[PDB]
Write a protein that binds this ligand. Structure first.
Ligand code: HEM
Ligand code: HEM
Lengths: 364, 365
């Protein structure tokens, strides 16, 4: 497939097929005028309509008046849409502006402090987020970079994160991707094909108390480093004890195939799978849509790499929070450290060529 | 199709090879003083490079070993294709201050002069040796550097690394020329992998140059260049085009109509980037540029921080990067870029067969 439809009852980039690359970015609002903001959201929408179809924003990247800066920076010229999806989310701090306090959804709870947290405030939070996912990373980077240029004067970029998963051009789509620890990551997850589960664990409903979120979701972002050098020193058995599956095939303890249903009582008490399993959390279930990241080498010469964890849910208090809390005694905690965090209320979708991002929240 | 690039040859792969879509560059610093210990590491690295470039796990594998033993391969590449992985090794001038290699530091491995406008981070510059990991799959390149580093534990350390999310170079003039983050095509007039007479003239060293052990190798100049994205995106279309000498949409030289139409340099502004970099403007000095675009989060001040990891292979740095870089002192592009990291490496000749090993010509075999 080449492109994903931008319009719909929901926003693309949540339930849709997971793309290869990612450029996440959290924005901070720098304007007080609500009409100027609404105007940006419409300009941003019009630009995303062009970005997700492989076209240049505005009037184009060249050919215009020579004395005028081009509307598009043009580093996407000659590339394909690449399954580009642009998902916008509203964070708690946004609702303290424009008189939106009383409309902040109660499902957008602030995350509590979890044991072991070492969050970098500079790389945390944000008034807005754009999740740019595509098979080609330059198409993602081009979209964030142009969306930031468009909104310059009304929004800035708080933090940005590049990620990567599979290379679909060479990796089969049905092959589970492996995280940087060497384990198949994503076996037991909510797929976008399961409309009944999405209606129960991901999408927000009107009765949930916030009508303007009817059709939207709530996103949780966690930047989790991995102690690559120590993990590579643990024995194969220790490694498999941590998760409760075997590294080669990814199968649960006592089973032969990856996708067999696990038998938790055979896993060690502090195994990752055993604790994060829904049965172990009053039925809490998540849609994990994260990416691996590798930013380079830190001061101490260690690999600055990990998982950019993303999770979509119908309510943050019945999704990420119960599950993350249960991971207090995770044996994986020895080899990981959360260092970035933010949450967002992702509104419903752009219904047609007249609608615009956040039209249910800001009205018409 | 994720096919593999042959690891053996008279030269190392990753130079004249078609530019791959991802990069993981890593400079190392030698910790051990034992010359026999380092030579052994070189033979261990070479063995792992044969496995990785072929799409196989290093050592005895990623699993199946003793449950009490750590796996030889970290396993994050299992189930992936070679993805055109290349691993190119280089020796830095600081490596010759040890193991008794002083008399073998190649004269062509010239230490760069101080260029005006530079603000080089010394912690992200230099290095006793380098390993260039290029591939169409980023998890493959990373998996390669990580496992090479783990094998060299106790004998080498990573000084700095640099990941390239996208190529800004081309050794294949027949394929689409990629674009840097300034929106312009980058790699139009560059040495192609099929142009042997030019590769022999500008890239591959020779025993006549004075360093026999470097016959068949090349010399690398790495330069981390930050881009002032904010000031560039304020310029007009005509200013951006006057900066380089080519138009933006087609990439043709000024006045012309097609990207690969040869330039008429007198029609460009006297400070046009193309006009000063052209070989005709540098006594015929020609480079083999093989760089990648990079992103580094945000400057912490509300702005995306991005740039270009510039790599240049040449037969002799004194006649390649140095003269061309000096001619860009007046370059109009200088008002939008800044060089913030730098390193040079003497890339030895390639691994001939399964009995050879990286740096065998230098260290004797
Ligand atoms: C670096 C950090 C992490 C790593 C390496 C990791 C890795 C894994 C692996 C290998 C599995 C088994 C394969 C699979 O079922 O997908 C798994 C399962 C799972 N993980 Fe994680 N995980 C991390 C963090 C988290 C966090 C922070 C959460 C939630 C707050 C989470 C929630 C889950 C869930 C819900 C499952 C499904 C288990 C089941 O239902 O059987 N993970 N993870
Ligand atoms: C951020 C820094 C740079 C950018 C954005 C940049 C961009 C470009 C562009 C757009 C072209 C024209 C298309 C092409 O011929 O590929 C070009 C050509 C060229 N550049 Fe640069 N460049 C940069 C740095 C450098 C440096 C540091 C050197 C050498 C020390 C260099 C040497 C050359 C050469 C030799 C050419 C080909 C000129 C010819 O047509 O003969 N560039 N570059």
């Amino acid at each position: 497939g080449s492109a994903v439809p931008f319009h719909g009852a929901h926003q693309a980039g949540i339930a849709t097929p997971v793309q290869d690359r990612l450029h996440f970015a959290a924005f901070d609002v720098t304007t007080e005028d609500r009409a100027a903001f609404v105007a940006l959201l419409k300009e941003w929408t019009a630009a995303a309509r062009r970005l997700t179809a492989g076209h240049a924003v505005g009037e184009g990247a060249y050919g215009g008046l020579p004395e005028a800066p081009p509307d598009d920076t043009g580093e996407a010229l000659g590339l394909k849409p690449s399954r580009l999806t642009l998902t916008i989310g509203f964070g708690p701090s946004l609702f303290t502006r424009f008189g939106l306090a009383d409309l902040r959804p109660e499902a957008l709870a602030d995350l509590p402090k979890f044991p072991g947290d070492n969050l970098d405030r500079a790389r945390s939070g944000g008034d807005l987020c754009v999740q740019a996912c595509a098979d080609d990373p330059q198409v993602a980077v081009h979209a964030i970079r142009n969306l930031a240029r468009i909104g310059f004067g009304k929004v800035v970029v708080r933090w940005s994160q590049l990620g990567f998963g599979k290379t679909s051009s060479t990796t089969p789509d049905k092959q589970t991707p492996r995280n940087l620890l060497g384990f198949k990551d994503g076996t037991r997850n909510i797929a976008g094909t399961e409309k009944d589960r999405l209606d129960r664990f991901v999408w927000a409903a009107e009765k949930d108390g916030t009508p303007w979120m009817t059709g939207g979701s709530y996103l949780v972002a966690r930047r989790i480093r991995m102690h690559i050098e120590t993990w590579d020193r643990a024995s194969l058995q220790e490694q498999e004890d941590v998760f409760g599956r075997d590294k080669g095939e990814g199968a649960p303890v006592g089973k032969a195939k990856e996708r067999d249903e696990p038998f938790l009582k055979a896993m060690k008490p502090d195994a990752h799978v055993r604790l994060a399993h829904p049965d172990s959390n009053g039925g809490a279930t998540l849609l994990r849509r994260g990416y691996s990241f590798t930013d380079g080498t830190d001061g101490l010469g260690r690999l600055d790499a990990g998982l950019f964890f993303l999770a979509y849910q119908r309510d943050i208090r019945t999704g990420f929070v119960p599950v993350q809390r249960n991971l207090a005694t995770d044996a994986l905690n020895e080899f990981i450290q959360h260092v970035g965090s933010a949450v967002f209320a992702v509104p419903p979708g752009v219904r047609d060529a007249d609608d615009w991002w956040g039209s249910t929240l800001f009205g018409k």
